[PDB]
Design a protein around this ligand. Structure first.
Ligand SMILES: Nc1nc2c(ncn2[C@@H]2O[C@H](COP(=O)(O)OP(=O)(O)NP(=O)(O)O)[C@@H](O)[C@H]2O)c(=O)[nH]1
Ligand SMILES: Nc1nc2c(ncn2[C@@H]2O[C@H](COP(=O)(O)OP(=O)(O)NP(=O)(O)O)[C@@H](O)[C@H]2O)c(=O)[nH]1
Lengths: 709, 122, 709
């Protein structure tokens, strides 16, 4: 159909659809687009004809793995649908979609109840005070009980959840719904949407539903006399109730329930009407706090095309022919083609908190550690995403989302604004991946481009963390889970031509002397030039942890020439650095070396010879005693339900974990604080999601180093 | 009747010319391969610049045989040479074009890609 | 970076770079491509690692012998650099590339003066109105005099040649160039291009160059008040001046001079800018006049992707794996895969003109002289050739050159158009070869496939002509020179396995009678079938050349049977066909046989008998007088420069030649009317071209026969 174009931010809606993995979100989006006229017939995820599930990975996994955007205009109101994956491994994409949205939509099926991942998704949506609306789908399923799921929703997320539309079906294929506020029964039995008054088969239940909905809304209505009036017998006007419901939903105070038949197309039209009326506008939505480049807080801009230019890229995609396709979320100002705009790369200062080992701020890619970058780029032709097709856009007003190609250095999450007024929207919450994945490149040609490919990968996916080990010299990919790790590996192996092989993550270790010992170092070599002769008799004794390297001089009579003692010290330091345990010795710290005697030659004494003699003496002293191996430990804070406390505690008991305390996270979850050695945490996430029906959520942070038990 | 140690011409773009039959897949101690039978082979001759080189173990399907083969209709087919097509594990050709005719037995063995790409199917 | 794929022909440019053999065309192409970012580092011709220098013949000859195409992207504008051979033996490939491109680049060395081959190539570029931009390369040479080359180009190639950019260096490695129109000096001394204001050491010279360039450009502009403004002291705007320079260069009026330092990368970026802005556009360039399939001309077609489908091949070759690499140049309409295009063989009628004597129209190859055929073939995969590897092309808009595989009947230069509306463009005028060579097969099986081998080679090589001689019973291959002959023989022995050995080419020859005589033929053969015995008496007289064979019978009383008169006749015809001068008797011509007497037998008369009787009578008649040999003198139209007419007079004097006139062909060359024996014309073309340095063109046409001197 026609390209949905909006000229005022009020007429634009940006709602992110969320839910469980495979909740039929893609089918719902296809049905809505067909109802919008863009698509002639509804696509099917199984057939792969859907607009949303167009990427290779989505069809390969037969489930949403990456988020997509669709644009629709209905009743003169444009809606920017944001379908997001429903699996925990892709939580960061869902959060990014939430940030770029002014509302949250939950697509759930009546035949299955609310799972714990859906509850955590509701919590995540709640902790931005986002408005949430409940959409029941898959009503064609035989086991689809709208009443049971509705109840569960009403009981779980407080009394603020009350249904808004009452379906009337046969229990197999819902033929239509009853409008509770409008007292109108919508019918689709003949294949046409017909709105007619209910015949009275549900009139008592309908009246009950209106009463409950009115009492719930009217409380949230500012008119406290409305409650009296309704309880006094006065019939509150339908338009007034509608407006009060719209305001309350814009206040993120109510969570209505609307049943939808994605397959049959039942309820799509009313659903679009509810999106266009009851949903908050970006002007109504509490726009995110906009910050100045230098960290000084700035007053948030009103959502208007005439205001100061303010936009934000929220997705980065790589295409072999088109190039980078960056989706830009605009909040204030107007974007016009060929204009030069300022690219604020997250200004990492706002994202430098925590980050564990990787200290991830934005776009990682250690050669690009932190983003914090500023650059002004001239944009090309504005476009809107329609699958792989890009509908050209004349101008981009505030409050809308657009796709821009050929962007050289634009990245996901970057704040776009006028170059004269650089701005910085508050960045989204980035989940920290805690599944390290060490890999090894197949060739140095791949390795050289590995930095560029990983930088671009983190530009596309801000949730992936990449850390290159400085001690073990291993490149390690931190991922959310099995699916996310697979996606990270595949995209690196294809989009950038970097052939890598996953290798074992090496946990850094430290070495120190376990006792006092002495070493005799001799370096005699008779080559074709000057002979070499240097002997050092050093004494190494243990030091308290963190004492570092101390040198004590006890040379008597100057047997070691005093010009070569610093060479002995340098050799000792180098030998500590190179390790003292075999061919794979870890750095030696917190030791003291006491050179008390030695031998030298009048002609064959050299600084290098004394360096070698000191290194060999240190090696002999290390071989003259035991060496302490120090392994690191990371504190782990876990949120798990109280019913599984014992299983996780016993699992940590088999994982040598030291329990620190069990803190009540809430009425049903307990925060568990414990420090676990990093070796035990290599596969902790996968086993935990097992030990928890996925409910297992934890964070880790390096604590200190301890010797191996 | 291709069998152990038989030499086969290659009818692909992969760059190999001739392959040697190592094993006739499709059951233990199976002896002969006819049209539409998958075998394991080793490449003996190749384009120097081809993706497939000499000495690498590959998987192929016979598309032409010199020995006559009966059809359910009473008709018989025969060719002048024994030829095979390099395939990957999902029963798809590694090349992009097929040279020469092929027997229609491939149709009932579900080698749709080879059948579609062949200039002639007999 | 991103693969060069432009969505409009205006954002596509194709330049056929020209110059002497090993003039650095490839090297400059590599430098430009690296400037665009396609190649990591610019390859060297000698090393053979470049994209253009990949073929066997190009590497072996250490120069360009077959043209190559590369695609480049610059600021959203596609650039198609087309390296062309620098040797006149492959000037057919250069002519095709010029026909394939809308702009030509003269890659010449600053240490080399403009040779006559360069002047003739400039003339060929000139009388097709093909725009040219002067490029000065090899400035790193110790004898590299940029100013000398500039002045030589300005004096030779008309006053329209004038410097555009002024190089600045230390005389050994040029450190930069000065942008005259931008009044800015670009410096590469520090390893980075730096557009900075000039230091002022040559401000007066720069200003003078700016003034000269402006006044030259204004001359070809539209605003006639611009000259009065500039001469009146008013400073014309930089942007307007630029636009005027673009107009002057595009319209095939101006020839700006560009210094290029390919080795150090100096000037490549500004050359790319000039190509992107000041160079002509495929729509702007005067496209070849289009023709209807059935001989009628058609109005030139616009370079519009939405217009009628129109394209023309520019190279053809066979690959066993990918398929026939048919370089197809798109002019009008959009070419897409799975489309059936018209494969008209140039409809040669429109190119029967020009081509010197050979009527070179389509692919030459006298066995297939003039294609003039029709065909509609479904194309396969659209690919952008990058050396051997082909860049996939999902969509090919007009104004581009692409390689299409699996084209069964495609030949070089064949016009490709829509099946519903077949169209014929104007193909290039090809320099038909004039050096004959004879190839003898080693056996019969190779000769059997030799026909299809030579047909395929002629389709691949449009400039090559293959001739079969029925009189002397040999196949004759005509090549432009020596290197092209080596290339074509290698291709024949390699692409088709034609094992042959070079042999001497034999010219047609005939025999004539020098006197009158009578013959007596007596035959007696009494075999096991029908006894044969016949006697005939004929008379032969010498006749003027061109008289042909004649017979007069004057037998008296029917001595010989009337039924056997045809037998004798045909016997005499066969005997004179077999010759009379020994066992190597050449075909006797222009002789009249006059039968008068003979004897007959009751039973021994027979067809064969009388045949031999007449034969032996012919032998006896020929035995009494002399036989004169005649060689075919062919009219030779010698075209040499007027200063070289004296050389042709001197050498043709030693060639037993007679001069029938020296008509001035044009302002430089002179048509010479002369007839020369055929034996002298086997090597005339090669020596003519060698002495004329590429300025020699000539025609041959058999006129009559002359006796041995
Ligand atoms: N009965 C029924 N099944 C549906 C419906 N929509 C999708 N499905 C089925 O559910 C599966 C995919 O559903 P869904 O998870 O929503 O697909 P997705 O959108 O790609 N994944 P996600 O929901 O996480 O975004 C398929 O087997 C599909 O046939 C629906 O409306 N009704
Ligand atoms: N010093 C110098 N040498 C060059 C330059 N360009 C090419 N050469 C050298 O000249 C030889 C080949 O040059 P060139 O004829 O331009 O190669 P080509 O382009 O493949 N052949 P052609 O010019 O006829 O198209 C090589 O030895 C190469 O190193 C240049 O700019 N400077």
């Amino acid at each position: 159909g026609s390209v949905p174009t909006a000229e005022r931010p009020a007429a634009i809606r940006n709602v992110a659809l969320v839910g469980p993995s495979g909740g039929g979100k893609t089918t719902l989006v296809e049905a809505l687009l067909v109802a919008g006229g863009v698509l002639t017939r509804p696509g099917s995820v199984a057939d792969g004809s859907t607009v949303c599930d167009f990427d290779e990975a989505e069809i390969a996994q037969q489930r949403s793995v990456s988020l997509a955007l669709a644009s629709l205009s209905h009743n003169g109101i444009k809606v920017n649908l944001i379908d997001t994956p429903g699996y925990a491994d892709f939580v960061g994409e869902l959060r990014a979609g939430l940030r770029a949205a002014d509302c949250a939509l939950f697509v759930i099926a009546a035949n299955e109840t609310i799972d714990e991942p859906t509850k955590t998704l509701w919590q995540e949506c709640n902790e931005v005070q986002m408005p949430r609306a409940v959409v029941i789908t898959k009503l064609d399923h035989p086991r689809a009980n709208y009443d049971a799921a509705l109840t569960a929703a009403q009981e779980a997320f407080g009394d603020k959840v009350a249904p808004l539309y009452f379906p009337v079906g046969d229990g197999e294929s819902c033929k239509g719904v009853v409008g509770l506020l409008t007292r109108t029964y919508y019918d689709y039995s003949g294949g046409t949407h017909t709105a007619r008054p209910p015949d009275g088969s549900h009139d008592a239940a309908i009246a009950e539903l209106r009463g409950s909905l009115i009492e719930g809304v009217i409380e949230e209505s500012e008119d406290e006399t409305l409650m009296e009036r309704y309880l006094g017998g006065e019939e509150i006007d339908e338009a007034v109730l509608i407006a009060d419901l719209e305001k309350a939903v814009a206040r993120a105070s109510f969570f209505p329930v609307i049943p939808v038949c994605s397959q049959s197309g039942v309820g799509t039209l009313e659903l679009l009407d509810i999106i266009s009326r009851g949903f908050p506008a970006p002007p109504e939505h509490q726009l995110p706090e906009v910050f100045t480049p230098q960290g000084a807080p700035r007053k948030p801009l009103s959502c208007d095309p005439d205001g100061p230019l303010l936009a934000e890229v929220v997705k980065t995609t790589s295409d072999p022919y088109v190039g980078r396709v960056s989706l830009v979320r605009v909040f204030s100002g107007t974007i016009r083609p060929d204009a030069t705009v300022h690219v604020s790369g997250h200004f990492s200062a706002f994202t430098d908190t925590s980050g564990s080992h990787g200290a991830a701020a934005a776009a990682d890619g250690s050669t690009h550690s932190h983003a914090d970058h500023d650059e002004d780029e001239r944009i090309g032709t504005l476009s809107f995403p329609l699958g792989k097709q890009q509908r050209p856009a004349p101008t981009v007003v505030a409050g809308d989302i657009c796709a821009i190609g050929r962007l050289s250095r634009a990245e996901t999450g970057d704040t776009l604004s006028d170059k004269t007024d650089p701005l910085v929207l508050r960045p989204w919450t980035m989940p920290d991946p805690l599944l390290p994945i060490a890999v090894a490149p197949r060739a140095k040609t791949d390795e050289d481009k590995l930095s560029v490919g990983l930088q671009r990968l983190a530009a596309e996916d801000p949730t992936l963390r990449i850390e290159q080990n400085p001690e073990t010299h291993q490149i390690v990919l931190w991922c959310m889970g099995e699916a996310h790790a697979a996606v990270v590996l595949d995209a690196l192996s294809r989009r950038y031509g970097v052939s890598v092989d996953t290798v074992e993550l090496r946990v850094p270790l430290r070495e120190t002397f376990a006792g006092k010992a002495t070493g005799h170092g001799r370096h005699v070599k008779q080559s074709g030039g000057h002979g070499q002769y240097a002997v050092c008799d050093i004494e190494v004794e243990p030091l308290p942890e963190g004492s570092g390297f101390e040198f004590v001089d006890k040379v008597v009579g100057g047997a070691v020439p005093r010009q070569f003692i610093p060479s002995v010290e340098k050799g000792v330091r180098a030998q500590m650095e190179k390790g003292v345990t075999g061919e794979s010795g870890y750095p030696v710290v917190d030791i003291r070396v006491t050179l008390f005697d030695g031998k030298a030659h009048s002609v064959d004494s050299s600084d290098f010879a004394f360096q070698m003699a000191g290194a060999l003496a240190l090696r002999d002293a290390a071989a003259a005693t035991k060496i302490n191996l120090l392994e690191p430990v990371d504190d782990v804070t876990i949120v798990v339900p109280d019913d599984l406390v014992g299983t996780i505690m016993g699992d940590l008991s088999g994982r040598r974990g030291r329990v620190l305390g069990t803190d009540k996270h809430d009425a049903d979850r307990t925060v568990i604080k414990a420090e676990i050695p990093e070796v035990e945490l290599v596969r902790y996430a996968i086993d935990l999601r097992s030990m928890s029906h996925g409910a297992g959520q934890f964070r880790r942070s390096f604590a200190r180093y301890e010797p191996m038990p | 009747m291709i069998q152990q140690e038989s030499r086969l011409k290659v009818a692909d773009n992969t760059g190999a010319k001739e392959i040697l039959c190592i094993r006739v897949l499709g059951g233990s101690s199976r002896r002969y391969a006819g049209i539409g039978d998958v075998i394991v082979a080793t490449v003996k001759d190749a384009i120097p610049g081809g993706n497939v080189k000499r000495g690498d173990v590959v998987k192929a399907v016979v598309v032409r045989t010199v020995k006559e083969r009966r059809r359910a209709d009473g008709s018989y087919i025969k060719f002048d040479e024994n030829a095979a097509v390099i395939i990957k594990n999902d029963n798809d050709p590694r090349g992009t074009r097929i040279f020469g005719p092929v027997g229609r037995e491939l149709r009932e063995k579900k080698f749709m890609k080879i059948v579609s790409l062949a200039p002639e199917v007999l």
